[PDB]
Design a protein around this ligand. Structure first.
Ligand SMILES: Nc1nc2c(ncn2[C@@H]2O[C@H](COP(=O)(O)OP(=O)(O)NP(=O)(O)O)[C@@H](O)[C@H]2O)c(=O)[nH]1
Ligand SMILES: [Cl-]
Ligand SMILES: [Mg+2]
Lengths: 202, 1013, 121
């Protein structure tokens, strides 16, 4: 049960960072621009079984756009992303939508306002209204603080499978197995490499 | 093996190409990734377009053809006028022919929808270049082709939709003003015939052709004149015929929504009737063909069958758009009274749907309505039953306010919030405002609703955590709506009930929810507390008992409610009340240790802050200083005994002391926040010792780096020591920002401060430097900078060059320093420009480089300041008049500031700051235009008496020629000639700038486009 | 989990150490559990992510492991794991785990050390 998902938005909005968090759990601090598109599989476990997503992480920056709207062909759902700390990225949402819904004529789409964790927010709540007339779900998210980070995928999973009561469920975990020179050197490097974000609550 | 297609010496194997495309779209892993690159490199090939017709023909893969069109699209939008005239006509032909061919094969028309829509867009892109100047018969020959097929007619409607989109909706950014106006006029001139085709198709039909036609209308409605809508039969069709079939139902409702925003006359009774009729019809159809007013729209939306969610969303948009504008047409005629109230009853049902963003759309309307009812006379009684229903909907669906710090978990326990629920902040304000409006419209009904709902919690017939919470929050939200006397009686009963309820319901889960709510209500009603001392006093005492509740959620809210109350009721704590032995602030202080015993450090500081609010009300400078001293009894005795042991020996090297010291300062910052200028005495008590502790701590940090390395800056011990340094700065910043006696700041505080902090910063390694130092200096320069010119120069000398070297390598490292650096420069450039005059030529050059570097940032906090500084600097130099330094500045840096501003405007990476870039460029051009620069900007180089105006043109035309070599000379000539003339009118000027950006993205733009006006 | 007893629950954030690129990387944030199997008397760490409820940790608390401290934290530990079946196949990770407070780090440790004594039997 697998579905093509395209992720579109302006350069720097935190698309690849959003996917990375969902893949591995990491928060990539650095901004390495995506070149064209990156395809990543992403499985969730639900009460209606496992759903799969082919997450096509498309490029935001124009110069690295590659095939552009060619990436959207046969896409069964989508995520449009912008940065609440950048007003220009929200003004561009309709352009991204235009391109997307010209190829993908009928699919569930989530609009997402990233980086809400940042104190000095620019794109105010009230301002966000483009989603309404175009029948898109909206969510405030933060790839950093994990705010509503599950919501885009949970909602898409509900629309694609066709069950509004689709909730995530824990994978019944198997009992783990009962199992030397390099180890000593590798551990030393680890202790002397400081853990990031020491002023977080966790 | 796959890279054969990237070879243009030999032929192109279409079969190989198709394998590469299949591998990308259907494949996976590294095979997918590899093909993906190959396809991109192919697509990006400048000569790739020549392979389009070859691919369009012999390829069987539809995706291969889609990319053929993507390659053409690029060629058409950008390099179209660069092609020979033959290639243009040939490309037009087989694009037109491809569309004919795919439409006349029924098989291909049905299953290859993606490819046709891309073909139709690719056509529209040509039109944008060719039509109607070099294609006058497009529309006439389009309306003719429609008759001879159903596939073609339908596809023509798809083309017209895309054309309308590109001309009216998406032209502002993609075309010049002159070209956008040209195409808009051309569509307007031929729309009389376009509509004739549209109106004909609508009469002769529920099918894919009708849908396609209705989709095009929706785009026309954005711009077409109202007469095409109101002087035809189309409203009747839309409002009745097209609503009864579900496939065309959705698009019609969207068209009618757009019709409800068309520019109409206001004194035309015939159109007023039509506007009532198309609504009346529409609402009748929903009643018969969809669902009645009584239908449970909450349950439907939740079930989510087919497009019921989308539908309900679009209905909500229609009902609120139309009513928002036209509802007054229903309020007066009694035959239309049922239609009015049903339309609203539908909205009431819609407002019950469990879905946030839908609710926000309905709430927007309710606010809009209740606002009008609150004012417009003889109206509210019309909606008495609608409102009465709406009070229930809102009160039963109140979102948790920010103040309530408790929430339920998945196990059934009431735990503290992990983060702030930041998405709902605005929702509450939206709900509050409406509910406040509804309370005023009928206070008796609001009171009766809530009081009864509450009585169904006491008896427990409707008892639940949700039911009690939503009700409690609602009661808090309507605070200050009622009159004081009607409020008193209301709150009285409400509190008694919640107290009565609090006693019976036991357990840490129950009391947690109840207490938090009682805290929210008490805190939201300050006026009641001001009148009722005995009550207020017992509350505050009880709040202090919550500061000993082991449950961390309740405890934290205790502290937040205490300060929230005190912020409003401060006065009743500073004076001695009747029947009281002492002013209560005095009772608070004497047991401050007991009260805050179980509280955490941060919560303790809040407590101290609240006390500072209360003390600041005391105006006798004797008692205020006495109270201040009594308040700081514990943090000063802790302090005094540390300053003894600290001065006795630099070894403080205990992590337990570092935390205690850090807390003595944090407490001072907290009391200083609330007491502002009234904090001075307490500052002086610790000021000299503190600056000595800053010097001592500073050394340990340096000593630990020497002994452990850069890594030590990450250790708990060092971070502890740095926190002390940072917090000390915060205290001096906090006071100075609010200080009233500036003489004392300069003569007492400033010189010891600069000595303690600057050299230390200058002489530490980058990673040990605190950005806070820069922040503290900004606030000092802000307030007393003008009084301490020598001290401002000292600040520059110590931080300017060394900080600049930390940030001039990349745009990412040392982000805090980066930001505060440019704040510091800005305030110096405003308040003490003299310090920059004293900088040597070499140091001033770096300062110029520093500003231009700040343009190139993508961070707004840095970018905004970067342009603002430059603007201020040009004002500063202009201010000096015709002196040598002003001349030397212009000769050195005027063309750097002109050429740098142009790079960031045009590189398509700094569109966020376009406005201020324009403003800055406008100012620089205006200087030459108004002969404000007294000396020649050239140097020998150009003829003797050449004016600066002529030379500015000569430089810019050269700059731009080399920067953008695909533009003609006239394109640049026109651009500048226009741009210079318009140097006084910003809005126009910017239009010319936006025009220029559009032209550099393509080839052979019309130089007459810059004549727009 | 129906055949296991919960010995210790504490909220935590887990990291794994990237070798090739010298840095720590987050693997999850949620409730780290100590689960003793009632049939085999073997204790294990099982930790799921918040909201999505996916396994970021799943290994036996081997008596071989020692909790070393990190240079930058007083509320964290770092140790080697030879077989973690969270992502599926067994794999050797160098984990770091961080907690809310110091007490949460120290309580974890003593329980971890108690867990290893149960496993040796
Ligand atoms: N503060 C904060 N920063 C975030 C958040 N999400 C992403 N970022 C940051 O934003 C920057 C860009 O992230 P990235 O994923 O590259 O965005 P992108 O849309 O994929 N860029 P592109 O489309 O060019 O490939 C990074 O520095 C990243 O750490 C967030 O929730 N909060
Ligand atoms: Cl007061
Ligand atoms: Mg990316």
């Amino acid at each position: 049960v697998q579905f093509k998902l395209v992720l579109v938005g302006d350069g720097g909005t935190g698309k690849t960072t959003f996917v990375k968090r969902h893949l591995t759990g990491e928060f990539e601090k650095k901004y390495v621009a995506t070149l064209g598109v990156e395809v990543h599989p992403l499985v969730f476990h639900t009460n209606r079984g496992p759903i799969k997503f082919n997450v096509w992480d498309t490029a935001g920056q124009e110069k690295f756009g590659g095939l552009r709207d060619g990436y959207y062909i046969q896409a069964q759902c989508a995520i449009i992303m912008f940065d609440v700390t950048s007003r220009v990225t929200y003004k561009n949402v309709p352009n991204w939508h235009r391109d997307l819904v010209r190829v993908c004529e009928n699919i569930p789409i989530v609009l997402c306002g990233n980086k809400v964790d940042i104190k000095d927010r620019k794109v105010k709540a009230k301002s966000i209204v483009f989603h309404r007339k175009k029948n898109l779900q909206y969510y405030d998210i933060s790839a950093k603080s994990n705010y509503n980070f599950e919501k885009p995928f949970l909602w898409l999973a509900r629309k694609l499978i066709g069950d509004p009561n689709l909730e995530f469920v824990a994978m019944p975990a198997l009992a783990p197995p009962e199992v030397a020179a390099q180890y000593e050197h590798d551990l030393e490097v680890a202790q002397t490499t400081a853990l990031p974000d020491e002023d977080d609550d966790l | 093996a796959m890279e054969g297609i990237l070879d243009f010496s030999n032929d192109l194997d279409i079969a190989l190409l198709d394998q590469v495309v299949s591998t990308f779209y259907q494949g996976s892993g590294v095979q997918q990734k590899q093909a993906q690159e190959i396809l991109t490199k192919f697509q990006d090939n400048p000569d790739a377009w020549q392979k389009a017709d070859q691919i369009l023909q012999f390829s069987t893969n539809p995706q291969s053809k889609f990319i053929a069109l993507s390659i053409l699209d690029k060629l058409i939008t950008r390099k179209w006028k660069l092609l020979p005239n033959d290639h243009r006509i040939g490309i037009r032909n087989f694009v037109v022919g491809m569309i004919i061919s795919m439409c006349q094969d029924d098989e291909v028309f049905k299953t290859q929808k993606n490819l046709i829509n891309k073909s139709d867009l690719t056509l529209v892109q040509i039109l944008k270049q060719e039509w109607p100047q070099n294609w006058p018969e497009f529309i006439p020959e389009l309306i003719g082709s429609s008759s001879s097929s159903v596939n073609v007619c339908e596809n023509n409607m798809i083309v017209l939709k895309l054309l309308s989109e590109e001309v009216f909706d998406f032209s502002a950014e993609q075309m010049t003003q002159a070209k956008a106006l040209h195409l808009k006029n051309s569509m307007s001139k031929e729309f009389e015939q376009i509509f004739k085709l549209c109106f004909q198709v609508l009469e002769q039909g529920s099918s894919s052709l009708i849908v396609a036609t209705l989709e095009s209308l929706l785009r026309y409605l954005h711009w077409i004149p109202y007469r095409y809508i109101y002087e035809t039969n189309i409203l009747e069709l839309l409002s009745t015929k097209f609503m009864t079939s579900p496939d065309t139902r959705a698009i019609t409702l969207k068209c009618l929504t757009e019709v409800s925003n068309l520019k109409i006359p206001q004194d035309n009774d015939l159109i007023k009737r039509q506007t009532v009729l198309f609504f009346q019809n529409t609402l009748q159809q929903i009643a018969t063909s969809v669902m009645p007013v009584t239908a449970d729209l909450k349950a439907t939306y939740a079930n989510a069958n087919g497009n019921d969610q989308s539908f309900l969303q679009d209905l909500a948009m229609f009902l609120t758009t139309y009513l928002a504008r036209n509802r007054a047409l229903l309020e007066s005629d009694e035959s239309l009274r049922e239609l009015l109230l049903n339309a609203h009853q539908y909205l009431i049902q819609l407002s019950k749907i469990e879905e946030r963003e839908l609710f926000k759309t309905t709430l927007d309307y309710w606010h809009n309505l209740v606002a009008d009812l609150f004012y417009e006379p003889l109206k509210k009684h019309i909606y008495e039953e609608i409102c009465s229903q709406l009070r229930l909907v809102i009160i039963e669906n109140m979102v948790r306010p920010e103040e309530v710090l408790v929430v339920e978990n998945d196990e059934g326990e009431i735990v503290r919030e992990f983060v702030k629920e930041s998405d709902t902040i605005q929702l509450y304000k939206s709900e509050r405002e409406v509910l406040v409006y509804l309370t005023h419209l009928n206070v008796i009904d609001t009171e009766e609703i809530m009081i009864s709902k509450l009585a169904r919690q006491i008896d427990g017939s409707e008892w639940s955590w949700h039911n009690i919470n939503t009700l409690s929050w609602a009661i808090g939200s309507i605070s200050g709506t009622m009159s004081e006397d009607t409020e008193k009686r209301f709150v009285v009963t409400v509190i008694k009930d919640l107290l009565d309820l609090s006693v019976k319901k036991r357990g840490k889960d129950n009391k947690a929810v109840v207490a938090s709510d009682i805290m929210y209500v008490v805190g939201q009603y300050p006026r009641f507390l001001k009148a009722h001392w005995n009550f207020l006093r017992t509350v505050i005492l009880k709040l202090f008992e919550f500061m000993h509740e082991t449950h961390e959620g309740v405890q934290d809210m205790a502290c937040d409610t205490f300060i929230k109350i005190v912020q409003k009721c401060k006065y009743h704590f500073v004076i001695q009340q009747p029947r009281e032995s002492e002013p209560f602030i005095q009772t608070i202080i004497r047991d401050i240790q007991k009260t805050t015993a179980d509280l955490q450090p941060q919560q303790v500081h809040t407590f101290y802050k609240a006390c500072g609010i209360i003390i600041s009300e005391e105006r006798s400078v004797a008692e205020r200083n006495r109270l201040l001293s009594d308040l700081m009894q514990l943090p000063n005795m802790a302090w005094d005994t540390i300053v003894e042991q600290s001065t006795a020996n630099p070894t403080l090297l205990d992590s337990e002391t570092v935390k205690i010291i850090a807390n003595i300062i944090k407490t001072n910052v907290a009391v200083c926040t609330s007491m502002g200028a009234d904090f001075y005495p307490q500052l002086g008590h610790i000021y000299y010792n503190m600056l000595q502790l800053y010097r001592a701590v500073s050394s340990m940090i340096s000593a630990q780096v020497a002994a452990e390395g850069l890594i030590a800056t990450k250790t708990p011990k060092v971070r502890g020591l740095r926190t002390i340094k940072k917090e000390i700065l915060k205290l001096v910043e906090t006071y100075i920002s609010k200080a009233r006696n500036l003489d004392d700041v300069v003569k007492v505080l400033v010189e010891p401060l600069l000595n303690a902090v600057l050299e230390d910063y200058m002489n530490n390694v980058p990673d040990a430097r605190d950005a806070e130092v820069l922040n503290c200096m900004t606030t000092v320069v802000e307030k007393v900078g003008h009084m301490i010119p020598q001290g401002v120069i000292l600040i520059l000398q110590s931080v300017f060059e060394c900080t600049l070297d930390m940030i001039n390598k990349d745009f990412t490292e040392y982000p805090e320093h980066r930001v505060e650096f440019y704040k510091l420069l800005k305030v110096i450039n405003e308040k003490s420009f003299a310090a920059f005059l004293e900088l040597p030529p070499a140091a001033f050059k770096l300062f110029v480089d520093a500003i231009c570097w700040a343009f190139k940032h993508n961070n707004r906090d840095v970018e905004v300041n970067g342009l603002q500084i430059a603007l201020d600097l040009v004002k500063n130099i202009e201010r000096m008049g015709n002196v040598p330094f002003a001349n030397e500045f212009h000769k050195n840096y005027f063309f750097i500031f002109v050429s740098e501003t142009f790079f960031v405007l045009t590189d398509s990476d700094h569109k966020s700051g376009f406005s201020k870039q324009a403003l800055l460029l406008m100012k620089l051009i205006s200087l030459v235009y108004d002969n404000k620069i007294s000396v020649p900007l050239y140097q020998a180089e150009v003829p003797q008496g050449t004016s600066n105006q002529v030379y500015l043109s000569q430089y810019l035309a050269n700059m731009l020629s080399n920067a953008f070599p695909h533009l003609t000379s006239e394109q640049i000539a026109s651009f500048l000639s226009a741009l210079t003339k318009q140097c006084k009118d910003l809005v126009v000027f910017k239009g010319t700038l936006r025009d220029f950006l559009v032209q550099i993205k393509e080839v052979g733009g019309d130089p007459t486009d810059y004549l727009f006006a | 989990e129906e055949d296991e007893e919960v010995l210790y629950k504490v909220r935590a954030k887990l990291f794994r150490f990237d070798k090739d690129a010298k840095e720590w990387k987050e693997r999850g944030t949620g409730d780290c559990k100590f689960l003793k199997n009632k049939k085999t008397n073997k204790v294990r760490i099982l930790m799921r992510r918040d909201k999505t409820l996916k396994i970021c940790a799943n290994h036996i608390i081997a008596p071989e492991y020692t909790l070393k401290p990190n240079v930058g934290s007083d509320r964290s530990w770092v140790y080697a794991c030879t077989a973690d079946i969270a992502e599926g196949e067994a794999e050797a990770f160098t984990f770091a785990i961080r907690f809310g407070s110091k007490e949460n780090a120290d309580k974890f440790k003593e329980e971890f050390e108690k867990a290893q004594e149960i496993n040796k039997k």
